[PDB]
Amino acid sequence: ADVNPKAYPLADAHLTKKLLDLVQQSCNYKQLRKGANEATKTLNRGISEFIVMAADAEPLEIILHLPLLCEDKNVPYVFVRSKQALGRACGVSRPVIACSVTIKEGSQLKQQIQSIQQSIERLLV
Amino acid sequence: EGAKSQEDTEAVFKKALLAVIGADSVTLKNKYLDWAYRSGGYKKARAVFKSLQESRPFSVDFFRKMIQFEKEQESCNMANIREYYERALREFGSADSDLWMDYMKEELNHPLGRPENCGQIYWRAMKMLQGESAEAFVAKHAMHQTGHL
Amino acid sequence: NELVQLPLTENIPAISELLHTPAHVLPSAAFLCSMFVNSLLLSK
Amino acid sequence: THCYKDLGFMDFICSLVTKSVKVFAEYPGSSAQLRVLLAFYASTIVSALVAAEDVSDNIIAKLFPYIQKGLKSSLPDYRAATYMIICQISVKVTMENTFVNSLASQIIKTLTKIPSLIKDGLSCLIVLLQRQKPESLGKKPFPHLCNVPDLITILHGISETYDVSPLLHYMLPHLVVSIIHHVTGEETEGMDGQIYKRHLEAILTKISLKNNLDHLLASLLFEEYISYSSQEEMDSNKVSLLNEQFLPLIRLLESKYPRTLDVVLEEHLKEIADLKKQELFHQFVSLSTSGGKYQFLADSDTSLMLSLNHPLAPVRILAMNHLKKIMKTSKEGVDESFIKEAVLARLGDDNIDVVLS
Amino acid sequence: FISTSTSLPRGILKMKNCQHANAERPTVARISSVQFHPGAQIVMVAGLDNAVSLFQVDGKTNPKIQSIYLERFPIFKACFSANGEEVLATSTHSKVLYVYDMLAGKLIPVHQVRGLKEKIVRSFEVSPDGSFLLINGIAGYLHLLAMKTKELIGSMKINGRVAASTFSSDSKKVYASSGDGEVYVWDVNSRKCLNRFVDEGSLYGLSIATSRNGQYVACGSNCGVVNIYNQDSCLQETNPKPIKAIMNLVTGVTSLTFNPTTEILAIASEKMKEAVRLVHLPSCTVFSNFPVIKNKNISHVHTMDFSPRSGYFALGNEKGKALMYRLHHYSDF
Amino acid sequence: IKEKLNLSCIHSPVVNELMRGIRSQMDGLIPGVEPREMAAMCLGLAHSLSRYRLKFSADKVDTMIVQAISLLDDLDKELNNYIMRCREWYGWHFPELGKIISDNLTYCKCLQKVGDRKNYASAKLSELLPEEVEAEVKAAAEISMGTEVSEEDICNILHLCTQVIEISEYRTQLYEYLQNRMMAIAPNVTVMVGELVGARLIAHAGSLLNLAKHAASTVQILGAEKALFRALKSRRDTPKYGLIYHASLVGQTSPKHKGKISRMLAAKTVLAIRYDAFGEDSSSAMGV
Amino acid sequence: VKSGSAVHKMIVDRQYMGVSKRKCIVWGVAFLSDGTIISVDSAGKVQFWDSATGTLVKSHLIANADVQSIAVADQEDSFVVGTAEG
Secondary structure (H helix, E strand, C coil), X not given: CCCCCCCCCECCHHHHHHHHHHHHHHHHXXXXXXXXXXXXXXXXXXXXXXXXXECCCXXXXXXXXXXXXXXXXXXXXXXXXXXXXXXXXXXXXXXXXXXXXXXXXXXCCHHHHHHHHHHHHHHCX | CCCCCHHHHHHHHHHHHHHCCCCCHHHHHHHHHHHHHHHCCHHHHHHHHHHHCCCCCCCHHHHHHHHHXXXXXXXXXXXXXXXXXXXXXXXXXXXXXXXXXXXXXXXXXXXXXXXXXXXXXXXXXXXXXCCHHHXXXXXXXXXXXXXXX | CCCCCCCCCCCXXXXXXXXXXXXXXXXCHHHHXXXXXXXXXXXX | CHHHHCXXXXXXXXXXXXXXXXXXXXXXXXXXXXXXXXXXXXXXXXXHHHHCCCCCHHHHHHHHHHHHHHHHCXXXXXXXXXXXXXXXXXXXXXXXXXXXXXXXXXXXXXXHHCHHHHHHHHHHHXXXXXXXXXXXXXXXXXXXXXXXXXXXXXXXXXXXXXXXXHHHHHHHHHHHHHHHHHHCCCCCCCCHHHHHHXXXXXXXXXXXXXXXXXXXXXXXXHHHHHHHHXXXXXXXXXHHHHHHHHXXXXXXXXXXXXCHHHHHHHHHHHHHHHCCCHHHHHHHHHHCCCCHHHCECCCCCCEHHHHHHCCCCHHHHHHHHHHHHHHHCCCCCCCHHHHHHHHHHHCCCCCHHHHHC | CECCCCCCCCCCCCEEECCCCCCCCCCCCCEEEEEECCCCCEEEXXXXXXXXXEEECCCCCCCEEEEEECCCCCEEEEEECCCCCEEEEEECCCCCEEEEECCCCEEEEECCCCCCCCCCCCCEEECCCCCEEEEECCCCEEEEEECCCCCEEEEEEXXXXXXXXXXXXXXXXXXXXXXXXXXXXXXXXCCCEEEEEECCCCCCEEEEXXXXXXXXXEEEECCCCEEEEEHHHHHHCCCCCCCEEECCCCCCCCEEEECCCCCEEEEECCCCCCCEXXXXXXXXXXXXXXXXXXXXXXXXXXXXEECCCCCEEEEEECCCCEEEEEECCCCCC | CCCCCCCCCCCCHHHHHHHHHHHHCCCCCCCCCCHHXXXXXXXXXXXXXXXXXXXXXXXXXXXXXXXXXXHHHHHHHHHHHHHHHHHHHHCCCCHHHHHHCCCHHHHHHHHHHCCCCCHHHHCCCCCCCCHHHHHHHHHHHHCCCCCCCCHHHHHHHHHHHXXXXXXXXXXXXXXXXXXXXXXXXXHHHHHHCCHHHHHHHHHHHCCHHHHHCCCHHHHHCCCCHHHHHHHHHHCCCCCCCHXXXXXXXXXXXXXXXXXXXXXXHHHHHHHHHHHHHHCCCCCCCCCC | CCCCCCCCCCCCCCECCECCCCCCXXXXXXECCCCEEEXXXXXXXXXXXXXXXXXXXXXXXXXXXXXXXXXXCCCCCCEEEEECCC
């Protein structure tokens, strides 16, 4: 409990494991952009499948621009509880509050990305 | 103040601030703050200061008086003392060498002060002060290091 | 039986900031001694 | 970097400080003129000791004479810089016992020269005694430590925020011995033993004892009382004097810390039983408010409290008879609650003879 | 002016390379387990070759005491009992657990445990006090067995896979780390879950260890981060904050071992060569001189152990070499 | 209603059907209310309700930030043109004054004080000018090259230079107004970069929400759009300062370190931009 | 019920102390005032769960087929289960 209500698409424990596993796979294929500034740039260039954010940023407003940009481009987005967990999945020694998986031609993760995309929109009902 | 009710004195002050808008408002705001402390208490002065803190034509006496009022109170919240100094230094920090020296002496002499902040105050004072005022601050601080103050 | 780590000079931030300021800006040694030795003590 | 890599430059800095202090010493009210320099003196040397990957014997050998020169001085800023240097040295290196003894002796003997730096000097001594090996400091500087004005009040003021355990851990074994010497013997000072007892009382009342200092104090009191009472000479009047001296201390220790002396007495029961020291144990537990529940029985070497509840029934009769004898006499070692709980517990057991008793 | 401190100094660890623990019996197979005997100068070496060997511990020669070869039993894990009179061994993909009683000279194969549905027995732990044996099962099941009679006492279930498990220092509790990054605390006497806390930044855990004095709990994860906690913090907090997160290792940590004096923590990863580190526990800083990468002898690390008084440190690798070092600070075996 | 007043209320599907019928015959049931009053009232209520739902208040609107700084530039261009006319027209009467006095406001005040060269001797300028400068001004009055002006000509010069001092007075009041509004709308931004630079950033993006959508790197180079696209097409090194060049932290530091500070400042500034745009609490603790 | 969020998810083993390819179906759930959840599944066992910690407390294997129905009396001292075998 004790989660900011502004992080509405809060994935549960089961979906969190699927998300962080796919993020870790995307790092091995060079298909991930790390950081809120880099995540914003992919949305402007229209090369992102989905956006993962961390719900435990002490001021949550520092990432709330991303949901607005995602709704314009029709890109799914979710929140996870720990920025430490998101940082380790990205392969970085520092906490990460937002990451973006990018569009790759011929990517082997296409079936897994599509299943995760379908899972995210279910949270929006 | 002498021969009329308290509410009418506040009414006179508010009308005066509407009529006088320019640099002549500087003296009016100071007398308004002094009346609030005497007619009311510390709470009345805080209410008047909050209302007037955004009307940009100011003087250093506006913030020096409020700092003195905070010191007379038994609480002496050090956070409020720094808060008044930052607002004054935002308005007159580019030219007032005395105001920077007063802020630095507050951190040393006050029982609640944090003397280790004096290093960053000196660094901030040198960059913000311009021309002769910067060199005056150097002389004033050098005098302060010895007992001549 | 328990193991306690005593404070060290380099780990304390305030002491390092005090030691990185120029000497003429620095206050008197009496204040520095109080702050330094209080930092070296174990808090309870 | 050049300060610790080149020791000639360090000697240059220290000699400059001493020379300038000596020059300004003749002019009264000239402390502020020496402010910046002394701060510079404090700022560099300490930082140099931080920067050095290892402090060698050469650095400490060069630094000690300047440390004593700073301690002997009357300028507060120069003494403060000396305290900072001492603290940093104690934090970084582990020293020989003799040199820690000699440094702590000089910190203690020159403490009262500047009355505004008593708290800083005591806190520096605490740091020194906490970061060095145990038993490094000897017994010679102990009287001068007891003669500083308002020692326990300054110690109490420090205790409100920081741990004061090393200094008390040093003082407590010496205070009890000094009290015993004062009661039975003579002291060079006129009333030194009384101020020793006053200091120990003030420590007990004001400063809370942590890190098992209560056990240490209780064990010291018990063992030293038994050791003095076990001497060849009888000294019955001296034993009575020791009893009337130790009674308030034991009672106050019981009052503030209830179970510590009980644990100490339980640990020493076997050792008292092995030798013929039952009567001394009886006297010592008679001194306390409670603890007469550990009296040995007349015929055997077992405590009353264990005798009352151990499985064998026939000797519980003797235990209850002993409790009745205690009831009829003026109770001085045992308290009301133990007796009441004992009889209410023994009303309900299986053996009817114990019920009758 | 300078003397030696009683405590272990930080920064530089004084070490000397010794003769290999398994010098008398050389092998080329992977070394699965190495362990020092609790009460005698004996080291036991086991590996993927079906042999189990026990040697007299001397820095010069390490003479062979006895070697026992099982038929088709590649040892996954072999350990001494807490009292030390018997040796327990297990294999990869085998149901039978082998118990070797040295005092009675009997080798008992425990192939059948009544009430246990587990098909294979490979991962297990022994309590410090010696009264319990815990077996890691499947579907997140933990089975508790009495040590003297090897009969099942009860079973505990966690949500998700069991990655690793360990006993408390007082042997009254069990720490089990799940496959999703969560760690459970179980009471031994009544098989009830006391608390559930989350290891920071762990997708899934690989190892866990506790200190002898009861002060520290350490968790290893896939990313190579070792988190060190106070034990009281884990018992009362759902999101405990670690004392220090060790970032030096880069690949998943598979081995954790605490020093008996609780001044050294040993961490290793088998996925990379020369991936072993030693941590000064009170300071939580890593010694800068232990893995001498110039020599290139260590390679992949599968097992680590400390002598009962920390005089020796042992290391087992994939090349069949049981490396051994002598720590000069400690003068007792 | 039942608790607050002793009154019984009935809700039912038959009630809902009755509501539908009244709405369908909305005209024809209330004779007093005109159709025009109904339509005009609907537009006013709909917009006020939508502003309430969207948290639009007089404080949250940042349009006056864009308007004030656009006007602030326009007043500067106007003031420059008129001052040159005072100096050129009065330079044919007393050319030495223009060279001595550089402050434009001080120049126009002296002209308003004293009409012709003859009156400079008797009149006093201590309040406007220092005494040694006043002596130089007084001395140059006797030895002059200028032509004598008519009475109508000197009246025209005074009226123009009077307009100058009024524009400068209002421009100061407008700048004080902008300081009030920036501290109220984005208090954290003003602590970071300042009132002027923060207002230029909002004016460039057109709104605070538009500025919030940008990344830190874009904010760093926002002003320098001409150099950015020159470098991108010709494949040269990109600019590194932008509008942030005039911020206080960038200005004070040495030219070698102005590049590192710019990206350090831009990264921290956007954090305050997001917080001011989306946060519901106006405070400067984060910015400080 | 106040905030419709899942406080706990409890994983049910597909086979009794084992794993199987066939998915486990929880056919009925009954809840007691003390805090225990009683569940019946297709694996043939009746299981007790604790709501506070979200962990299994006890399992009872009673049939070789699906256990499909649960019912609890108003006084929570007795309950009844019905299985696929009749």
